[PDB]
């Protein structure tokens, strides 16, 4: 029992990186009462979550995760916190296939709302891999899925407390920082310009390798109807720099363009998408946000990267993808 | 809903009085969940309650309060937010049957918190806790004193036990007990656990709308003090005036916290018998008596040093003694 940690939050006193490990590992667990962890996360949010807090808790979670077979070899994570406010498609879904098909392996990680994660479910998808053969998946296609639900087990203890709550907490930037394969690359997006920055040092406490956090015109994502704030890790060392469409040699769009639908339309715009098929504006959104990925692989020419994921793209070999990967 | 509230108590936002009054208007009839009762509770402890949010949540309190036949000549009330963690006697309600001794109106509210409390111990004198307003409102009228038990006039009080008891920690509902009384009184000694409440509290007090009111603290006491200076707020013709009183200024010798000290249920039903009676340690009658002797101050009596005085000779005498057993007898 942590009576001691909640008395200093409630002091609004940060926690260290130990302790919010514990309070979170409690957390995970069900130690705490409905009104304790509403207390410790609505203390946390009014004072502002630091750095090595969010590393504690992240921390905290991974351990109580479910054992994925971590490869060797350098493959990423391309997930946001979500929730921008601008109703837009997948594009972190539709990129990690895209990506795969352009010489990067993508471990993706991320749990269902429509939303996200149903469109997977609808081309196919059997969410509840099993870590055997997603690990297989993503040796032999370059991807694979892996839904949090199944490996974040204790993750329900907080569900009902958040949804009763209504309102943004720790748990919303905690999402993206805890793949279960412990990828070394990542290219995460978040719902606030405020949050870039914060996240960016979390992961080099965390101590990623290579990894961006980006923000656009209110998207969590790489954006092309408008500029995108960048914070970059590499080499445990961090560089803040703003990109535009232009940067990709790709034409700036409009946020409309970029507008979700329905299930039904959803899968089929992805589907027509990875195809080559697609409109556009979506094919230029992903192409950026898969170039920005690539950088983390070390292809430092975001030109030349969007313009092979816009022709992976066009080429339909993507959504041969996701295909291969229904079998299984 | 009341998320818009809510999200604003989320930003370090005040409430104004109306919009606390919708918040813990709904949080009286168990609407809340336990994960957001919680997070409006920490919310507001956090950034620091203010006055017209304190009132709000008591006018709340209030309006679900069961019935009670106020009356229209002068009383007053005299209680404490207690855990001061000071372990003293029961100094409101032993000067609840002194001051009524002498003349004075008390319709005493009492809380509950635990045996070892007011309540317990008018209990193990035999009075009864669930008697009606029209018996209680009766003994006020001849027996110059009443105790208007919690649990029984607030039924919604209740939907925030389980979720005060799990924090661990003080919230706004520790100081909204001394001031949701049934009868709401035109005068009251309000005692509370930390001196940064009293002028805070006071300010309530106007905004609720009392004649006659003061606030204090003493060295750690929800209590007006003899081993130490009390810090006092006093509402008086609509204005607040911040002064400290000390020992002397009430004529009374200073003794220590120690000696007020006490102890199982039992020995303080005895202690409280043998004082009231006429027959208890000096510690006690003296800490009895500058307690009083600020409550009549609220009653146009300004010389602290005569209303001690009549606080003594009425202990001496006994008689609040015989009040006690009389208010059993109903
Ligand atoms: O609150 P909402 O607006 O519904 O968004 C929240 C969701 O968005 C994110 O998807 P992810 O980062 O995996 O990107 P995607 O859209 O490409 O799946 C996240 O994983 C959530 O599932
Ligand atoms: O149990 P605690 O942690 O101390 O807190 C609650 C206290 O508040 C009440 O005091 P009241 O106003 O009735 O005055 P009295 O106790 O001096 O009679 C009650 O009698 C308890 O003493
Ligand atoms: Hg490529
Ligand atoms: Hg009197
Ligand atoms: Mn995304
Ligand atoms: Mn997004
Ligand atoms: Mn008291
Ligand atoms: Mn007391």
Same mark, same amino acid.
């Given at each position: 029992?942590?009576?001691?940690?909640?008395?200093?939050?409630?002091?609004?006193?940060?926690?260290?990186?130990?302790?919010?490990?514990?309070?979170?590992?409690?957390?995970?667990?069900?130690?705490?009462?409905?009104?304790?962890?509403?207390?410790?996360?609505?203390?946390?949010?009014?004072?502002?979550?630091?750095?090595?807090?969010?590393?504690?808790?992240?921390?905290?979670? +991974?351990?109580? !995760? @479910?054992?994925?077979?971590?490869?060797? $070899?350098?493959? =990423?994570?391309? /997930?946001?916190? &979500? *929730?921008?406010?601008?109703?837009?498609?997948?594009?972190?879904?539709?990129?990690?296939?895209?990506?795969?098909?352009?010489?990067?392996?993508?471990?993706?990680?991320?749990?269902?709302?429509?939303?996200?994660?149903?469109?997977?479910?609808?081309?196919?998808?059997?969410?509840?891999?099993?870590?055997?053969?997603?690990?297989?998946?993503?040796?032999?296609?370059?991807?694979?899925?892996?839904?949090?639900?199944?490996?974040?087990?204790?993750?329900?203890?907080?569900?009902?407390?958040?949804?009763?709550?209504?309102?943004?907490?720790?748990?919303?930037?905690?999402?993206?920082?805890?793949?279960?394969?412990?990828?070394?690359?990542?290219?995460?997006?978040?719902?606030?310009?405020?949050?870039? +920055?914060?996240? !960016? @040092?979390?992961?080099?406490?965390?101590? $990623?390798?290579? =990894?961006?956090? /980006?923000?656009? &015109? *209110?998207?969590?994502?790489?954006?092309?109807?408008?500029?995108?704030?960048?914070?970059?890790?590499?080499?445990?060392?961090?560089?803040?720099?703003?990109?535009?469409?232009?940067?990709?040699?790709?034409?700036?769009?409009?946020?409309?363009?970029?507008?979700?639908?329905?299930?039904?339309?959803?899968?089929?715009?992805?589907?027509?998408?990875?195809?080559?098929?697609?409109?556009?504006?979506?094919?230029?959104?992903?192409?950026?946000?898969?170039?920005?990925?690539?950088?983390?692989?070390?292809?430092?020419?975001?030109?030349?990267?969007?313009?092979?994921?816009?022709?992976?793209?066009?080429?339909?070999?993507?959504?041969?993808?996701?295909?291969?990967?229904?079998?299984?």
């Amino acid at each position: 029992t942590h009576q001691p940690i909640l008395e200093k939050l409630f002091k609004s006193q940060s926690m260290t990186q130990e302790e919010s490990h514990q309070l979170f590992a409690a957390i995970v667990r069900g130690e705490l009462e409905d009104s304790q962890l509403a207390a410790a996360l609505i203390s946390m949010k009014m004072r502002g979550e630091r750095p090595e807090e969010i590393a504690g808790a992240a921390s905290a979670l +991974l351990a109580d !995760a @479910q054992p994925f077979p971590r490869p060797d $070899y350098d493959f =990423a994570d391309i /997930v946001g916190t &979500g *929730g921008d406010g601008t109703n837009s498609i997948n594009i972190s879904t539709a990129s990690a296939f895209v990506a795969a098909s352009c010489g990067a392996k993508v471990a993706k990680h991320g749990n269902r709302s429509a939303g996200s994660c149903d469109l997977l479910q609808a081309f196919g998808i059997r969410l509840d891999m099993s870590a055997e053969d997603s690990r297989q998946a993503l040796d032999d296609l370059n991807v694979c899925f892996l839904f949090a639900p199944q490996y974040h087990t204790g993750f329900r203890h907080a569900m009902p407390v958040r949804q009763q709550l209504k309102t943004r907490t720790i748990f919303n930037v905690l999402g993206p920082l805890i793949n279960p394969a412990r990828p070394p690359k990542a290219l995460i997006g978040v719902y606030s310009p405020e949050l870039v +920055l914060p996240i !960016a @040092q979390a992961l080099k406490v965390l101590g $990623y390798k290579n =990894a961006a956090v /980006v923000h656009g &015109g *209110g998207m969590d994502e790489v954006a092309i109807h408008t500029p995108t704030q960048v914070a970059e890790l590499n080499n445990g060392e961090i560089e803040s720099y703003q990109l535009s469409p232009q940067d990709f040699g790709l034409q700036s769009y409009s946020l409309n363009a970029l507008q979700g639908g329905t299930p039904e339309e959803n899968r089929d715009i992805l589907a027509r998408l990875l195809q080559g098929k697609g409109d556009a504006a979506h094919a230029r959104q992903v192409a950026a946000n898969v170039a920005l990925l690539l950088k983390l692989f070390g292809q430092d020419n975001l030109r030349h990267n969007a313009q092979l994921a816009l022709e992976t793209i066009r080429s339909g070999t993507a959504f041969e993808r996701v295909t291969a990967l229904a079998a299984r």
